[PDB]
Amino acid sequence: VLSPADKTNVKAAWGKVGAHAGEYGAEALERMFLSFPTTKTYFPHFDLSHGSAQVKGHGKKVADALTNAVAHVDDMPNALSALSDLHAHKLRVDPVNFKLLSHCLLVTLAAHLPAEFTPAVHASLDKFLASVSTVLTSKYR
Amino acid sequence: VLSPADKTNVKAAWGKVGAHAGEYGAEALERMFLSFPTTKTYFPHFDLSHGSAQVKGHGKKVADALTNAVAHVDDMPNALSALSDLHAHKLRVDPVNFKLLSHCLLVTLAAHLPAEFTPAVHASLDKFLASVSTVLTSKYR
Amino acid sequence: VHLTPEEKSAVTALWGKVNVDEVGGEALGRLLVVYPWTQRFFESFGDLSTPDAVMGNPKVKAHGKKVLGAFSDGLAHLDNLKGTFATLSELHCDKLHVDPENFRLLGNVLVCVLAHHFGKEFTPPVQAAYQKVVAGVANALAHKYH
Amino acid sequence: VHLTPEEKSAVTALWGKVNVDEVGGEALGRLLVVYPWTQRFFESFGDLSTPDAVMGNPKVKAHGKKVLGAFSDGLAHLDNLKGTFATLSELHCDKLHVDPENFRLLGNVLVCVLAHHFGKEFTPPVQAAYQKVVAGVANALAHKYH
Numbered sequence: 001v002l003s004p005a006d007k008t009n010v011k012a013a014w015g016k017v018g019a020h021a022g023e024y025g026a027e028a029l030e031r032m033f034l035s036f037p038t039t040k041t042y043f044p045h046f047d048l049s050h051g052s053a054q055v056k057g058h059g060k061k062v063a064d065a066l067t068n069a070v071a072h073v074d075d076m077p078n079a080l081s082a083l084s085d086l087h088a089h090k091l092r093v094d095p096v097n098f099k100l101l102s103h104c105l106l107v108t109l110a111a112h113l114p115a116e117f118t119p120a121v122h123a124s125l126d127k128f129l130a131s132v133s134t135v136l137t138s139k140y141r
Numbered sequence: 142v143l144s145p146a147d148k149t150n151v152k153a154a155w156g157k158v159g160a161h162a163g164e165y166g167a168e169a170l171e172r173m174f175l176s177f178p179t180t181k182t183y184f185p186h187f188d189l190s191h192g193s194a195q196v197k198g199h200g201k202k203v204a205d206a207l208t209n210a211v212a213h214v215d216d217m218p219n220a221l222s223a224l225s226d227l228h229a230h231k232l233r234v235d236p237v238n239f240k241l242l243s244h245c246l247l248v249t250l251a252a253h254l255p256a257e258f259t260p261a262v263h264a265s266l267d268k269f270l271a272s273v274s275t276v277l278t279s280k281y282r
Numbered sequence: 283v284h285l286t287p288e289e290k291s292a293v294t295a296l297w298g299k300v301n302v303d304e305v306g307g308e309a310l311g312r313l314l315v316v317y318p319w320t321q322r323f324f325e326s327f328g329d330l331s332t333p334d335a336v337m338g339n340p341k342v343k344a345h346g347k348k349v350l351g352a353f354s355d356g357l358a359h360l361d362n363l364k365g366t367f368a369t370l371s372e373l374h375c376d377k378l379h380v381d382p383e384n385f386r387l388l389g390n391v392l393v394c395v396l397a398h399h400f401g402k403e404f405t406p407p408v409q410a411a412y413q414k415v416v417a418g419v420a421n422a423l424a425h426k427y428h
Numbered sequence: 429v430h431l432t433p434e435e436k437s438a439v440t441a442l443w444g445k446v447n448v449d450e451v452g453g454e455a456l457g458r459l460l461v462v463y464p465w466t467q468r469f470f471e472s473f474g475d476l477s478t479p480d481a482v483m484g485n486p487k488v489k490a491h492g493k494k495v496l497g498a499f500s501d502g503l504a505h506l507d508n509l510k511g512t513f514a515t516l517s518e519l520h521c522d523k524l525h526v527d528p529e530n531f532r533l534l535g536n537v538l539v540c541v542l543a544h545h546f547g548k549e550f551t552p553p554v555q556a557a558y559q560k561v562v563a564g565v566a567n568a569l570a571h572k573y574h
């Protein structure tokens with residue numbers, strides 16, 4: 001569960017992302033494909049090459065789902081139910097992969113927000129992502 | 142998230158343990174210690190040899206908690222609040238371990254309740270153990 | 283995989299009583315039912331809408347025995363599950379796009395099926411050797427993923 | 429571990445620019461803050477109640493320097509991580525009773541500390557190589573557990 005400071009921390013860290021969310025989503029993705037090649041098994045129909053816009057296109061989508069979750073930090077389950085419906089029933093992504101992407105996102109953020117990526121902010125973001133991941137896999141069975 | 146079918150199924154299987162819960166709890170512990178020796182890092186103060194009384198005693202502890210979870214299937218969080226407090230603040234067992242124990246409890250059960258351990262009963266208890274696990278690690282951070 | 287000979291001897295010994303047909307059928311069936319997202323690789327098997335729809339499906343079954351049958355044979359190469367599985371590795375990666383985590387899932391369903399079936403005989407220690415087996419298999423199969 | 433040579437060359441190049449005293453304190457401190465349960469091994473370290481109590485705690489900061497000094501040395505032996513960490517594997521098992529999962533947690537927190545520090549410089553491919561490294565270390569550290 002997100003505490004008031006978790007929320008505050010994620011509203012502010014994400015706030016700074018501002019503009020690059022999509023840019024950042026894309027990189028998180030590239031970081032995941034590369035470090036955790038097993039993750040590529042879900043994106044067989046994609047171009048997984050540096051700068052593919054399939055990846056850029058996908059990145060932005062991810063980042064907007066996160067922006068939305070942030071915006072409804074107080075009602076995440078409802079805010080992303082559509083997205084859980086989808087991952088649960090159509091994509092059927094092994095839950096373990098949510099943890100790998102989340103990590104790549106944390107790596108991406110730390111790489112772009114030197115100044116705001118504090119222990120406190122790091123902790124908050126990690127919990128945030130895990131709750132996002134939890135929401136997303138809630139309808140698997 | 143336990144469906145009424147799931148709940149019904151766990152009530153079933155568990156009722157049949159009846160008297161042996163303790164016996165089964167201890168066997169589960171014993172299969173975990175041997176199958177996943179890293180789990181032993183948490184019981185350095187237990188004699189872990191076969192037929193140990195500590196293990197034995199601990200088995201029944203766990204068994205009884207599971208029983209209590211079965212009984213309060215619809216309010217686990219409240220039924221197990223004390224226990225989540227305990228695991229999260231004093232014990233602090235790494236969340237990944239909940240999975241090894243659950244699995245061992247699954248094998249134990251499978252091996253003692255052949256007839257009742259149907260694909261659907263199996264699917265159910267698995268979700269059961271998973272929610273018990275989530276409840277115990279819900280207050281970690 | 284690091285098996286003791288007592289470990290290896292006990293593996294071998296119960297393996298000898300495996301009816302791979304029904305055990306492979308049971309193992310793959312249970313997977314699809316317990317971890318329903320593993321079903322994503324078998325829509326072409328047909329109706330998987332129920333445990334029975336799934337357990338009783340001839341496709342599940344025959345795939346079960348196929349898999350379990352390839353399982354059986356790395357037991358003959360416990361010393362090189364790696365080279366034993368290299369091609370299957372590439373095929374699951376390169377062609378089937380199977381998430382190797384599914385392999386772990388399988389190993390655990392299996393260990394559960396074996397217990398189910400051997401009751402009393404699938405002892406703390408027999409489970410333990412098998413756990414070592416299904417873990418080496420999962421890794422050998424995941425080996426060539428790139 | 430099986431690093432390409434451009435991979436081991438990348439690992440090594442960057443590693444040369446890291447300040448171990450403070451990177452060590454930083455990764456250990458961040459571990460205790462993000463995965464607070466890991467604090468179970470350090471009650472004798474004092475106040476760890478707040479991020480600042482943790483991050484600026486001199487025992488936390490002095491312990492961090494040892495781990496990374498130790499990590500830094502296995503870096504010189506990518507080809508023999510296991511032998512490198514064999515005594516430390518035993519120590520951690522046999523005496524400290526540390527769940528090896530703590531090793532993976534630290535690896536990731538480390539990866540994040542590097543990114544944070546190197547920025548643009550910690551590129552996808554540079555991360556992928558470190559991911560390989562930290563996994564190797566976690567495994568070599570867990571090797572002797574029993």
Ligand code: HEM
Nearest residue numbers: 039042043058061062065066083091093097098101132133
């Ligand atoms: C917190 C993490 C995640 C978020 C926010 C997220 C969000 C999304 C969104 C917004 C879409 C597009 C849906 C649409 O078209 O409206 C999508 C699709 C997809 N996701 Fe996720 N996802 C996450 C985790 C994952 C993971 C871990 C994987 C696999 C490793 C994955 C695999 C997929 C795939 C294969 C698609 C289909 C996209 C396509 O074909 O273009 N997702 N996800």
Ligand code: HEM
Nearest residue numbers: 180183184202203206207224232234238239240242273274
């Ligand atoms: C189904 C999941 C679990 C349940 C229901 C459970 C239940 C319990 C119960 C009822 C107690 C006794 C507390 C008391 O004295 O009132 C306990 C203690 C303990 N548990 Fe858990 N537990 C679970 C998972 C785990 C796991 C996975 C581990 C570590 C591998 C673990 C390690 C411990 C330890 C070390 C103790 C304290 C032993 C002692 O001081 O004698 N538990 N647990």
Ligand code: HEM
Nearest residue numbers: 320323348349350352353370378380384385388389419423
């Ligand atoms: C874990 C140990 C496993 C082994 C030893 C194994 C073995 C095999 C073998 C020998 C084949 C046949 C190749 C051929 O047609 O020449 C096969 C096919 C296949 N396996 Fe695996 N398998 C394993 C796990 C899995 C899992 C867990 C899944 C997914 C849930 C999976 C999905 C598939 C698929 C989709 C095919 C293609 C079958 C067809 O339609 O011909 N495998 N497997």
Ligand code: HEM
Nearest residue numbers: 466469470494495496498499516519524526530531534569
């Ligand atoms: C990840 C790679 C790691 C390395 C290379 C490492 C290295 C070391 C070294 C060199 C020592 C001192 C040895 C001695 O006193 O003889 C030590 C002690 C210790 N380590 Fe590790 N360590 C690692 C990870 C961890 C983790 C993840 C934890 C748990 C969070 C941990 C917990 C401890 C504890 C509790 C001590 C004893 C400290 C004291 O109270 O004196 N270590 N470690």
